[PDB]
Amino acid sequence: SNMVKIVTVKTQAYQDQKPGTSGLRKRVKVFQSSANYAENFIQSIISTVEPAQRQEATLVVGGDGRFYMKEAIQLIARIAAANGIGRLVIGQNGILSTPAVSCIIRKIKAIGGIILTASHNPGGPNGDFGIKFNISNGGPAPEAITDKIFQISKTIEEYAVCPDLKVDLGVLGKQQFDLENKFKPFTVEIVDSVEAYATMLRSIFDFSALKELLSGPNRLKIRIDAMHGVVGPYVKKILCEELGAPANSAVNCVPLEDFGGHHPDPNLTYAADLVETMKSGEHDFGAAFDGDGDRNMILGKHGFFVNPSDSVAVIAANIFSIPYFQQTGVRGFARSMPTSGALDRVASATKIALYETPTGWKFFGNLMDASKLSLCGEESFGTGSDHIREKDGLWAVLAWLSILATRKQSVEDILKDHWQKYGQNFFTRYDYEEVEAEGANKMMKDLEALMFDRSFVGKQFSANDKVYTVEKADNFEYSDPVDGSISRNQGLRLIFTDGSRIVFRLSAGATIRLYIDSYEKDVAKINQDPQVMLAPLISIALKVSQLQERTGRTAPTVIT
Ligand SMILES: [Mg+2]
């Protein structure tokens, strides 16, 4: 029945419901076996909305398809209705990519959205579940708001719910619910998962040029792997149906509740199927997306790997292949500090501002909201623009296709031309996972003390046929030019006079991340194996940090 009662449910607070920057993520089993775990958190989110503003408010709700998503969406609808939220907009079947949620929030001027995703983390009966809150600019809720949610969640003693309310998520259109002894109805609009996002992309990119690129006998041959995650229907409906790529272009493009039993995390080993496909030489372009669609990996013919640090640089160097940027102009470029310096060479050569930010969304969002940031990238497979306030993997793929269309060259030839023009930033990230915290912290503190010494700048480091001179060494700090905040201890940087860098970052077991960025201006040495070219700087990095001595690790856990 669509005439439902409002009921107050006594509850007991949990103490660990901390939203963080990417949402509250817990094992699916925790949500299911902890009474009112989800309910308490949803209520805590909604309690940050001023009662007076709820009736005219809309929340956008959707997720990445993982197990438990639809049950959580029903819970959100039952609690939102009871709390006097006037409207929910929900993707069909509950499905909305994270970029789609950001798109819709900003399009319909909603107060925010609740995204049911744990991004690249596994899903399924034994996987993870995440609940992410975005606010009215379409982006992640900032710390002041997540702090409030957490504080409310720790002392909550009841929540309001319409236990008999049920939303049909499969069916497009408005469902109205009349609440007992409430004048105004509760309205749920089920929208097509893809339409609003596709329409945005239709305005950003030249779909006529892309159709021509992707169809016919001379078509660019592409393989696009959604990794059984949320981007699946977007690939099928935009790249295949609208832009005319053959249906086999869409790989793993049916969303699955367990992401096919694998991690929806795009890199050369988690997406090893796509890589093996590309190695056959039949296809010109490959890409893979993460579970909720804000990360992307870019491959060329024969499986040529475009480092995410290079990808944002190539997009920057060819940015006016994209109609959006022809119209807005380029307001600025940004990358996270550990990302390679390739983007900087394009910004310097084209005289556009380069913002080097700590890891995290808020720094990019601030700059975008100041009209100072058009294109951003992160070495962790992140690429985006100010078209929305989340990173956007499928957008990054259509950027590449637009560039491929105007350049009329292979992905590899585009990179070779790029390196010949700007030099090459050989780049890798070493992850040392689950190291003992005491050793890793001692490693960081000792290295920081050593770098702080007056004589460390100007020191020279040699290995084989390579001499590196320290130009600067510090613990990265960022004063945000919008909110005034000062972020400290964002990473140990060893900056060398030749344009190369070593960066150390720390992030239930500590993880050391070691980023190596070797700038090579010699045309003869471009397109080499990065691991070979980076070996001198890796040796210098392990020796000055004494990482093996402090952690007992002789090798990183993961190399990217
Ligand atoms: Mg993600």
Coordinates of C-alpha atoms and ligand atoms in Angstrom, one line a residue:
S1 CA 0.0 0.0 0.0
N2 CA 1.1 3.6 -0.7
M3 CA -0.6 4.9 2.4
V4 CA 2.0 4.3 5.2
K5 CA 2.5 5.1 8.9
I6 CA 5.4 6.9 10.5
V7 CA 6.9 5.1 13.5
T8 CA 9.7 5.9 15.9
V9 CA 12.1 3.1 16.6
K10 CA 14.3 2.9 19.7
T11 CA 17.9 2.1 18.8
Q12 CA 21.3 1.7 20.2
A13 CA 24.2 3.8 18.9
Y14 CA 27.3 2.4 17.3
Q15 CA 30.6 4.0 18.0
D16 CA 32.5 3.5 14.7
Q17 CA 30.1 5.0 12.1
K18 CA 32.7 7.5 10.8
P19 CA 31.8 8.7 7.3
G20 CA 35.3 9.6 6.2
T21 CA 36.1 11.1 2.8
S22 CA 34.8 8.2 0.7
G23 CA 31.9 7.1 2.9
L24 CA 31.3 4.6 5.7
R25 CA 32.6 1.2 4.5
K26 CA 32.1 -2.0 6.5
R27 CA 31.8 -5.6 5.6
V28 CA 28.4 -6.5 4.3
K29 CA 28.1 -9.0 7.2
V30 CA 28.4 -6.1 9.6
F31 CA 25.4 -4.2 8.1
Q32 CA 23.3 -7.4 8.1
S33 CA 24.2 -8.7 11.6
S34 CA 24.3 -5.3 13.5
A35 CA 20.8 -4.3 14.4
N36 CA 19.9 -0.8 13.0
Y37 CA 23.5 -0.3 11.8
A38 CA 22.3 1.1 8.4
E39 CA 19.2 2.7 9.9
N40 CA 21.3 4.6 12.5
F41 CA 23.6 5.9 9.8
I42 CA 20.9 7.0 7.3
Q43 CA 19.1 8.7 10.2
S44 CA 22.3 10.4 11.2
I45 CA 22.9 11.7 7.7
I46 CA 19.3 13.0 7.4
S47 CA 19.4 14.6 10.8
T48 CA 22.0 17.1 9.5
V49 CA 19.3 18.5 7.2
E50 CA 17.4 21.3 8.9
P51 CA 13.8 20.2 9.5
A52 CA 12.5 23.4 7.9
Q53 CA 14.3 22.5 4.6
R54 CA 13.4 18.9 4.3
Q55 CA 10.0 19.2 2.5
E56 CA 11.5 21.1 -0.4
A57 CA 14.6 19.0 -0.5
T58 CA 15.5 16.2 -2.9
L59 CA 18.1 13.5 -2.2
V60 CA 19.6 11.6 -5.2
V61 CA 20.0 8.0 -4.3
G62 CA 21.8 5.2 -6.1
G63 CA 24.7 2.8 -6.1
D64 CA 27.1 0.5 -7.9
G65 CA 25.0 -2.6 -7.9
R66 CA 26.8 -4.5 -5.2
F67 CA 25.0 -7.0 -2.9
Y68 CA 22.8 -5.4 -0.2
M69 CA 22.4 -2.1 -2.3
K70 CA 18.7 -2.4 -3.0
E71 CA 17.9 -3.3 0.6
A72 CA 19.8 -0.2 1.8
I73 CA 18.0 1.9 -0.8
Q74 CA 14.7 0.7 0.6
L75 CA 15.8 1.6 4.1
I76 CA 16.9 5.1 2.9
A77 CA 13.4 5.6 1.4
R78 CA 11.6 4.5 4.5
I79 CA 13.7 6.8 6.7
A80 CA 13.8 9.8 4.4
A81 CA 9.9 9.7 4.1
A82 CA 9.5 9.5 7.8
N83 CA 11.8 12.4 8.4
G84 CA 9.9 14.7 6.0
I85 CA 12.3 14.6 3.1
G86 CA 10.0 15.7 0.2
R87 CA 11.6 13.7 -2.6
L88 CA 14.1 11.1 -3.6
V89 CA 15.4 10.7 -7.2
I90 CA 16.6 7.1 -7.6
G91 CA 18.2 5.4 -10.6
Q92 CA 16.3 2.5 -12.0
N93 CA 17.1 -0.7 -10.2
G94 CA 18.9 1.5 -7.7
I95 CA 21.8 1.9 -10.2
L96 CA 23.6 5.2 -10.4
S97 CA 27.3 5.6 -11.1
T98 CA 29.1 8.0 -8.7
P99 CA 29.6 10.5 -11.6
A100 CA 25.9 10.2 -12.5
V101 CA 24.9 11.0 -8.9
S102 CA 27.1 14.1 -9.0
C103 CA 25.6 15.0 -12.4
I104 CA 22.0 14.7 -11.2
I105 CA 22.5 16.4 -7.9
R106 CA 23.9 19.5 -9.7
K107 CA 21.3 19.3 -12.6
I108 CA 18.2 19.3 -10.4
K109 CA 19.7 21.4 -7.7
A110 CA 19.3 18.7 -5.0
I111 CA 20.5 19.1 -1.5
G112 CA 22.7 16.1 -1.9
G113 CA 22.8 12.4 -2.5
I114 CA 23.5 9.1 -0.8
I115 CA 25.6 6.7 -2.9
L116 CA 25.6 3.0 -2.1
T117 CA 29.1 2.1 -3.2
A118 CA 32.4 0.9 -1.8
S119 CA 34.1 1.8 -5.1
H120 CA 36.9 -0.7 -5.9
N121 CA 36.4 -2.8 -2.8
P122 CA 34.9 -6.3 -3.4
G123 CA 31.2 -6.8 -3.1
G124 CA 28.9 -9.8 -2.5
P125 CA 27.5 -11.7 0.5
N126 CA 31.1 -11.8 1.9
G127 CA 32.3 -8.4 0.5
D128 CA 32.2 -4.8 1.5
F129 CA 29.4 -2.2 1.6
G130 CA 29.7 1.5 1.6
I131 CA 27.3 4.5 2.3
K132 CA 28.6 7.8 0.9
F133 CA 27.0 11.2 1.4
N134 CA 27.4 13.9 -1.2
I135 CA 26.2 17.5 -0.7
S136 CA 24.6 20.1 -2.9
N137 CA 27.5 21.0 -5.1
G138 CA 27.5 17.3 -6.2
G139 CA 30.7 16.4 -4.4
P140 CA 31.7 14.5 -1.2
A141 CA 30.4 15.9 2.0
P142 CA 33.3 17.8 3.6
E143 CA 34.8 17.1 7.1
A144 CA 32.6 19.6 9.0
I145 CA 29.5 17.7 7.8
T146 CA 30.9 14.1 8.1
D147 CA 32.0 15.1 11.6
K148 CA 28.4 16.1 12.5
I149 CA 27.1 12.8 11.1
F150 CA 29.6 10.8 13.1
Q151 CA 28.8 12.8 16.3
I152 CA 25.0 12.3 15.8
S153 CA 25.6 8.6 15.1
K154 CA 27.5 8.0 18.3
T155 CA 24.6 9.2 20.6
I156 CA 21.5 8.4 18.5
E157 CA 18.7 6.8 20.5
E158 CA 15.9 6.6 18.0
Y159 CA 15.1 7.0 14.3
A160 CA 11.9 7.6 12.4
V161 CA 10.8 5.1 9.7
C162 CA 7.9 4.1 7.6
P163 CA 8.2 0.4 7.9
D164 CA 5.5 -0.5 5.4
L165 CA 6.8 1.8 2.6
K166 CA 8.2 -0.1 -0.4
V167 CA 9.7 1.5 -3.6
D168 CA 9.4 -0.3 -6.9
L169 CA 13.0 0.4 -8.2
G170 CA 12.4 -1.4 -11.5
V171 CA 9.8 1.0 -12.8
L172 CA 10.3 4.5 -14.2
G173 CA 8.3 7.5 -13.1
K174 CA 6.8 9.0 -9.9
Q175 CA 5.6 7.0 -7.0
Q176 CA 3.8 9.0 -4.4
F177 CA 3.5 7.9 -0.8
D178 CA 0.9 9.5 1.5
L179 CA 2.2 9.6 5.1
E180 CA -0.4 9.1 7.9
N181 CA -1.2 12.4 9.5
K182 CA 1.1 14.3 7.1
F183 CA -0.2 16.9 4.7
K184 CA 2.5 16.7 2.0
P185 CA 3.2 13.4 0.2
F186 CA 6.6 11.8 -0.1
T187 CA 7.6 11.5 -3.7
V188 CA 10.1 9.0 -5.3
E189 CA 11.1 9.6 -8.9
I190 CA 12.8 6.6 -10.6
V191 CA 14.9 7.8 -13.5
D192 CA 16.8 5.9 -16.2
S193 CA 20.3 5.2 -14.8
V194 CA 22.1 6.6 -17.8
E195 CA 20.0 9.4 -19.4
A196 CA 21.0 12.4 -17.4
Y197 CA 24.7 11.5 -17.4
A198 CA 24.5 10.6 -21.1
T199 CA 22.9 13.9 -21.9
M200 CA 25.7 15.7 -20.0
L201 CA 28.3 13.9 -22.0
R202 CA 26.3 14.6 -25.2
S203 CA 26.9 18.3 -24.5
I204 CA 30.5 17.9 -23.4
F205 CA 31.8 15.8 -26.3
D206 CA 31.2 15.8 -30.1
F207 CA 29.0 12.7 -30.4
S208 CA 28.9 13.1 -34.2
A209 CA 32.7 12.9 -34.4
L210 CA 32.8 10.0 -31.9
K211 CA 30.1 8.1 -33.9
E212 CA 32.2 8.5 -37.0
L213 CA 35.3 7.4 -35.2
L214 CA 33.6 4.2 -33.7
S215 CA 31.4 3.0 -36.6
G216 CA 32.0 1.7 -40.1
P217 CA 34.8 -0.3 -41.8
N218 CA 37.7 2.0 -40.7
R219 CA 36.4 2.3 -37.1
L220 CA 38.7 2.6 -34.1
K221 CA 38.4 -0.7 -32.4
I222 CA 37.9 -0.5 -28.7
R223 CA 37.4 -2.8 -25.7
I224 CA 35.8 -1.2 -22.6
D225 CA 35.8 -3.2 -19.4
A226 CA 33.3 -2.1 -16.7
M227 CA 34.6 -5.0 -14.5
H228 CA 31.0 -6.1 -13.8
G229 CA 30.4 -2.8 -12.0
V230 CA 28.1 0.2 -12.3
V231 CA 29.5 1.7 -15.6
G232 CA 28.3 -1.3 -17.6
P233 CA 24.9 0.2 -18.7
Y234 CA 26.6 3.5 -19.4
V235 CA 29.1 1.9 -21.8
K236 CA 26.3 -0.1 -23.6
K237 CA 23.9 2.8 -23.9
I238 CA 26.5 5.6 -24.8
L239 CA 29.4 3.9 -26.6
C240 CA 27.5 1.0 -28.2
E241 CA 23.9 2.1 -28.7
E242 CA 24.4 5.8 -29.2
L243 CA 27.9 6.1 -30.7
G244 CA 27.6 2.8 -32.7
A245 CA 30.5 0.9 -31.3
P246 CA 29.8 -2.9 -31.9
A247 CA 28.3 -4.6 -28.9
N248 CA 31.5 -6.6 -28.2
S249 CA 33.1 -3.3 -27.4
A250 CA 31.3 -3.5 -24.0
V251 CA 33.2 -6.0 -21.9
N252 CA 31.9 -7.1 -18.4
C253 CA 29.2 -4.5 -18.9
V254 CA 26.4 -6.3 -17.0
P255 CA 26.4 -5.1 -13.3
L256 CA 26.8 -8.0 -10.9
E257 CA 26.2 -8.0 -7.2
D258 CA 29.6 -9.6 -6.6
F259 CA 31.4 -7.9 -9.4
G260 CA 31.9 -11.3 -10.9
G261 CA 33.7 -12.5 -7.8
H262 CA 36.6 -10.1 -8.3
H263 CA 37.7 -6.6 -7.3
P264 CA 36.3 -3.9 -9.6
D265 CA 39.6 -2.0 -9.5
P266 CA 41.3 -1.1 -12.8
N267 CA 45.0 -1.9 -13.0
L268 CA 47.1 -4.3 -15.0
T269 CA 46.5 -7.3 -12.8
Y270 CA 42.9 -6.8 -11.6
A271 CA 41.9 -6.1 -15.2
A272 CA 44.3 -8.8 -16.6
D273 CA 41.5 -10.1 -18.9
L274 CA 41.3 -6.7 -20.7
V275 CA 45.1 -6.6 -20.9
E276 CA 45.3 -10.1 -22.3
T277 CA 42.6 -9.1 -24.9
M278 CA 44.5 -6.0 -25.9
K279 CA 47.7 -8.0 -26.2
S280 CA 46.3 -9.7 -29.3
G281 CA 46.8 -6.6 -31.4
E282 CA 43.2 -6.5 -32.9
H283 CA 42.1 -3.5 -30.9
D284 CA 43.3 0.1 -30.9
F285 CA 42.1 1.2 -27.4
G286 CA 41.1 -0.4 -24.1
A287 CA 39.9 0.9 -20.8
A288 CA 38.7 -0.4 -17.5
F289 CA 36.6 1.3 -14.8
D290 CA 36.3 0.8 -11.0
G291 CA 33.1 -0.4 -9.3
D292 CA 31.4 3.1 -9.1
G293 CA 32.9 4.6 -12.2
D294 CA 35.3 7.3 -11.0
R295 CA 38.5 5.6 -11.8
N296 CA 39.9 4.5 -15.3
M297 CA 42.8 2.7 -16.8
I298 CA 43.8 3.5 -20.4
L299 CA 45.4 0.9 -22.7
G300 CA 46.7 1.1 -26.2
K301 CA 47.2 -1.4 -29.0
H302 CA 49.1 -4.5 -27.9
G303 CA 48.3 -3.6 -24.3
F304 CA 50.4 -0.4 -24.2
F305 CA 49.9 1.0 -20.7
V306 CA 49.2 4.7 -20.4
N307 CA 50.3 5.7 -16.9
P308 CA 47.5 7.7 -15.2
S309 CA 50.0 10.5 -14.7
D310 CA 50.7 10.6 -18.4
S311 CA 47.0 10.3 -19.3
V312 CA 46.0 13.6 -17.7
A313 CA 49.0 15.2 -19.3
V314 CA 48.0 13.9 -22.8
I315 CA 44.5 15.2 -22.2
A316 CA 45.8 18.5 -21.1
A317 CA 48.1 18.8 -24.2
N318 CA 45.2 18.1 -26.5
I319 CA 42.4 19.5 -24.4
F320 CA 40.7 21.6 -27.2
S321 CA 39.8 18.4 -29.0
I322 CA 37.0 18.4 -26.5
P323 CA 34.1 20.9 -27.2
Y324 CA 33.5 21.6 -23.5
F325 CA 36.9 23.1 -23.1
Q326 CA 36.7 25.0 -26.4
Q327 CA 33.7 26.7 -24.7
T328 CA 34.8 27.2 -21.1
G329 CA 38.5 27.6 -21.8
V330 CA 41.1 26.1 -19.5
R331 CA 40.7 27.6 -16.0
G332 CA 43.6 25.6 -14.6
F333 CA 45.3 22.2 -14.2
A334 CA 45.7 20.2 -11.0
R335 CA 47.2 16.9 -9.8
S336 CA 47.8 15.3 -6.5
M337 CA 51.3 15.9 -5.2
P338 CA 52.4 12.2 -5.6
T339 CA 51.3 12.2 -9.2
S340 CA 54.1 12.5 -11.8
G341 CA 55.3 15.9 -13.1
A342 CA 54.1 15.2 -16.7
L343 CA 51.1 17.5 -16.3
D344 CA 53.4 20.3 -15.1
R345 CA 55.4 20.3 -18.3
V346 CA 52.2 20.8 -20.3
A347 CA 51.0 23.5 -18.0
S348 CA 54.4 25.3 -18.0
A349 CA 54.7 25.1 -21.8
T350 CA 51.1 26.4 -22.3
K351 CA 51.2 28.9 -19.4
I352 CA 48.3 27.5 -17.5
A353 CA 48.2 27.4 -13.7
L354 CA 49.3 24.1 -12.1
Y355 CA 47.9 23.4 -8.7
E356 CA 49.7 20.6 -6.7
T357 CA 47.3 19.4 -4.0
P358 CA 47.5 16.8 -1.2
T359 CA 45.7 13.6 -1.9
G360 CA 41.9 14.0 -1.6
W361 CA 38.9 15.4 -3.4
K362 CA 38.3 18.6 -1.4
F363 CA 41.3 20.4 -2.8
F364 CA 40.2 19.9 -6.4
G365 CA 36.6 20.7 -5.6
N366 CA 37.6 24.0 -3.9
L367 CA 39.6 25.0 -7.0
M368 CA 36.8 24.0 -9.4
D369 CA 34.3 26.0 -7.3
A370 CA 36.6 29.0 -7.6
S371 CA 36.6 28.7 -11.4
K372 CA 40.3 27.9 -11.2
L373 CA 40.4 24.2 -12.2
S374 CA 39.4 22.6 -15.6
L375 CA 41.3 19.3 -15.6
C376 CA 42.6 17.2 -12.7
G377 CA 44.4 13.9 -12.5
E378 CA 45.7 11.5 -9.8
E379 CA 48.3 8.8 -10.3
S380 CA 45.8 6.4 -8.7
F381 CA 43.8 6.0 -12.0
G382 CA 41.9 9.3 -11.4
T383 CA 41.0 11.8 -14.1
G384 CA 38.3 14.4 -14.1
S385 CA 37.1 17.9 -15.0
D386 CA 34.9 20.5 -13.5
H387 CA 31.9 19.1 -15.4
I388 CA 30.9 17.6 -12.1
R389 CA 32.4 17.2 -8.6
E390 CA 33.6 13.6 -8.7
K391 CA 36.2 12.0 -10.8
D392 CA 34.7 10.4 -13.9
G393 CA 36.2 7.4 -15.6
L394 CA 33.9 7.1 -18.6
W395 CA 34.4 10.8 -19.2
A396 CA 38.1 10.2 -19.3
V397 CA 37.6 7.6 -21.9
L398 CA 35.5 9.9 -24.2
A399 CA 38.2 12.5 -23.7
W400 CA 40.7 10.0 -25.1
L401 CA 38.5 9.0 -28.0
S402 CA 38.0 12.7 -28.9
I403 CA 41.8 13.1 -28.9
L404 CA 42.2 10.0 -30.9
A405 CA 39.7 11.3 -33.4
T406 CA 41.3 14.7 -34.0
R407 CA 44.9 13.3 -33.8
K408 CA 44.3 10.3 -36.2
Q409 CA 47.1 8.4 -34.5
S410 CA 47.5 5.3 -32.3
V411 CA 47.6 5.7 -28.5
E412 CA 51.2 4.7 -28.5
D413 CA 52.2 7.2 -31.2
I414 CA 50.4 9.9 -29.3
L415 CA 52.5 9.1 -26.2
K416 CA 55.7 8.9 -28.2
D417 CA 54.9 12.4 -29.7
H418 CA 54.1 13.6 -26.2
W419 CA 57.4 12.4 -24.7
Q420 CA 59.4 13.8 -27.7
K421 CA 57.8 17.2 -27.1
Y422 CA 57.9 17.4 -23.2
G423 CA 60.3 14.8 -22.2
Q424 CA 59.1 11.7 -20.4
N425 CA 58.3 11.4 -16.7
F426 CA 59.0 7.7 -15.9
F427 CA 56.7 6.9 -13.0
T428 CA 55.9 4.1 -10.6
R429 CA 54.2 3.7 -7.3
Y430 CA 55.6 1.1 -4.8
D431 CA 53.0 -0.1 -2.2
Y432 CA 54.3 -1.8 0.9
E433 CA 51.2 -3.2 2.5
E434 CA 50.5 -4.2 6.1
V435 CA 54.0 -3.2 7.4
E436 CA 54.4 -2.9 11.1
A437 CA 53.3 0.5 12.2
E438 CA 56.2 1.2 14.5
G439 CA 58.9 0.5 11.8
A440 CA 57.1 2.5 9.1
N441 CA 56.6 5.5 11.4
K442 CA 60.2 5.3 12.5
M443 CA 61.2 5.2 8.9
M444 CA 59.2 8.4 8.1
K445 CA 60.4 10.3 11.2
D446 CA 64.1 9.4 10.6
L447 CA 63.9 10.3 6.9
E448 CA 62.1 13.6 7.7
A449 CA 64.8 14.5 10.3
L450 CA 67.5 13.7 7.7
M451 CA 65.9 15.8 5.0
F452 CA 65.4 18.7 7.5
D453 CA 69.2 19.1 8.0
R454 CA 70.7 22.2 6.5
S455 CA 73.2 20.2 4.5
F456 CA 70.7 17.8 2.8
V457 CA 69.8 20.2 0.0
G458 CA 72.7 20.1 -2.4
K459 CA 73.6 16.5 -1.5
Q460 CA 74.3 14.3 -4.5
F461 CA 73.2 10.7 -5.0
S462 CA 74.7 8.3 -7.6
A463 CA 73.7 4.9 -9.0
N464 CA 75.2 3.5 -12.3
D465 CA 75.2 6.3 -14.9
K466 CA 72.9 8.8 -13.0
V467 CA 73.8 11.6 -10.6
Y468 CA 70.9 13.3 -8.7
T469 CA 71.2 16.5 -6.7
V470 CA 68.8 17.4 -4.0
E471 CA 67.1 20.7 -4.9
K472 CA 64.5 20.6 -2.1
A473 CA 63.3 18.2 0.6
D474 CA 60.3 18.6 2.8
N475 CA 57.1 17.3 4.4
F476 CA 54.5 18.5 1.9
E477 CA 52.2 21.2 3.2
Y478 CA 49.3 22.9 1.4
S479 CA 47.5 26.1 2.3
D480 CA 44.2 25.9 0.5
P481 CA 43.6 29.3 -1.3
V482 CA 39.7 28.9 -0.9
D483 CA 38.9 27.7 2.6
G484 CA 42.1 28.9 4.2
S485 CA 42.9 25.4 5.7
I486 CA 46.5 24.3 6.1
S487 CA 47.1 20.6 5.4
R488 CA 50.4 19.4 7.0
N489 CA 52.4 16.2 6.9
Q490 CA 51.1 15.3 3.4
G491 CA 54.2 13.4 2.3
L492 CA 58.0 13.4 2.3
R493 CA 59.3 14.8 -1.0
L494 CA 62.9 14.5 -2.3
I495 CA 63.0 17.0 -5.2
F496 CA 66.0 16.8 -7.5
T497 CA 67.5 19.5 -9.7
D498 CA 66.8 17.5 -12.9
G499 CA 63.0 17.5 -12.4
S500 CA 62.8 14.1 -10.8
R501 CA 61.2 13.3 -7.4
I502 CA 60.9 10.7 -4.7
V503 CA 57.8 10.9 -2.5
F504 CA 57.0 8.8 0.6
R505 CA 53.5 8.7 2.0
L506 CA 52.0 6.6 4.9
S507 CA 48.3 5.7 4.8
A508 CA 45.0 -2.4 10.8
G509 CA 48.4 -2.5 9.2
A510 CA 50.3 0.5 7.8
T511 CA 50.9 1.0 4.1
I512 CA 54.0 2.7 2.7
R513 CA 53.5 4.3 -0.7
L514 CA 56.7 5.2 -2.5
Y515 CA 56.3 7.2 -5.7
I516 CA 59.2 7.6 -8.1
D517 CA 59.2 10.2 -10.8
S518 CA 62.3 10.3 -13.1
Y519 CA 62.2 13.1 -15.7
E520 CA 64.1 12.1 -18.9
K521 CA 64.8 14.9 -21.4
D522 CA 66.8 12.6 -23.7
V523 CA 64.6 11.7 -26.8
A524 CA 66.7 8.5 -27.2
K525 CA 65.5 7.1 -23.8
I526 CA 61.7 7.6 -24.3
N527 CA 59.3 4.6 -24.4
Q528 CA 61.7 2.5 -22.3
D529 CA 60.5 0.2 -19.6
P530 CA 59.8 2.5 -16.6
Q531 CA 61.1 -0.1 -14.1
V532 CA 64.5 -0.1 -15.9
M533 CA 64.7 3.7 -16.1
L534 CA 63.6 4.2 -12.5
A535 CA 66.0 1.7 -10.9
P536 CA 68.6 4.3 -10.1
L537 CA 66.1 6.5 -8.2
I538 CA 64.5 3.4 -6.6
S539 CA 67.9 2.4 -5.2
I540 CA 68.5 5.9 -3.9
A541 CA 65.0 5.9 -2.3
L542 CA 65.4 2.6 -0.5
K543 CA 68.9 3.6 0.7
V544 CA 68.1 7.1 2.0
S545 CA 64.9 5.8 3.7
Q546 CA 66.5 2.5 5.0
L547 CA 63.1 1.0 4.2
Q548 CA 64.3 -2.5 4.1
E549 CA 66.0 -2.1 7.4
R550 CA 63.0 -0.5 9.1
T551 CA 60.3 -2.8 7.6
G552 CA 62.1 -6.0 6.8
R553 CA 60.7 -5.7 3.3
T554 CA 63.0 -6.5 0.4
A555 CA 60.3 -5.8 -2.2
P556 CA 57.0 -3.8 -2.5
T557 CA 53.8 -5.7 -2.3
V558 CA 52.4 -4.0 -5.5
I559 CA 54.1 -2.1 -8.3
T560 CA 52.0 0.2 -10.5
Ligands
MG1 MG 35.7 4.5 -6.9

